[PDB]
Write a protein that binds this ligand. Structure first.
Ligand SMILES: [K+]
Ligand SMILES: [K+]
Ligand SMILES: [K+]
Ligand SMILES: [Mg+2]
Ligand SMILES: [Mg+2]
Ligand SMILES: [Mg+2]
Ligand SMILES: [Mg+2]
Ligand SMILES: [Mg+2]
Ligand SMILES: [Mg+2]
Ligand SMILES: [Mg+2]
Ligand SMILES: [Mg+2]
Ligand SMILES: [Mg+2]
Length: 60
RNA sequence: ACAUUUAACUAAAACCCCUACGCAUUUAUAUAGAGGAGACAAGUCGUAACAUGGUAAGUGUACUGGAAAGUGCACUUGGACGAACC
């Protein structure tokens, strides 16, 4: 069954470390879909204010 | 509500009421639902305060606004006015 994957930047500390790290994780799953030849369909994508990700949703 | 009797050549016998409490009063627990306060985050919106915080802040009171808060009158310094003259 297909997976609707969602990543959210947890509110645990100051700065954009949580939001910046979310972008890296989201790119990791997107690249992992290509490695497994999986179709990666973007559903939601809300970038942060410092080149990061607040929350993102995608379908694999 | 309720009666002084019997007996008395030594002296004794007899004596025995019925009405209250209604889930009425008093104090708590449990709550359909409606809110508050503290803790917490960093999410969302703005930047009110702390420097003359960029409208100096605040008190009382009134009205208004998503939200801090905004404005009127009076008061306070828990602000300043640069401290000879020019
Ligand atoms: K908040
Ligand atoms: K003010
Ligand atoms: K002040
Ligand atoms: Mg209740
Ligand atoms: Mg301000
Ligand atoms: Mg001024
Ligand atoms: Mg201003
Ligand atoms: Mg001000
Ligand atoms: Mg005032
Ligand atoms: Mg007031
Ligand atoms: Mg006004
Ligand atoms: Mg006016």
């Amino acid at each position: 069954n297909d997976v609707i994957l969602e990543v959210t930047a947890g509110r645990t500390t100051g700065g954009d470390i949580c939001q910046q790290f979310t972008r890296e994780i989201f790119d990791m799953y997107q690249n992992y879909s290509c490695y497994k030849h999986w179709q990666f369909e973007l559903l939601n994508y809300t970038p942060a204010d410092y080149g990061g990700l607040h929350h993102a949703a995608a379908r694999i």
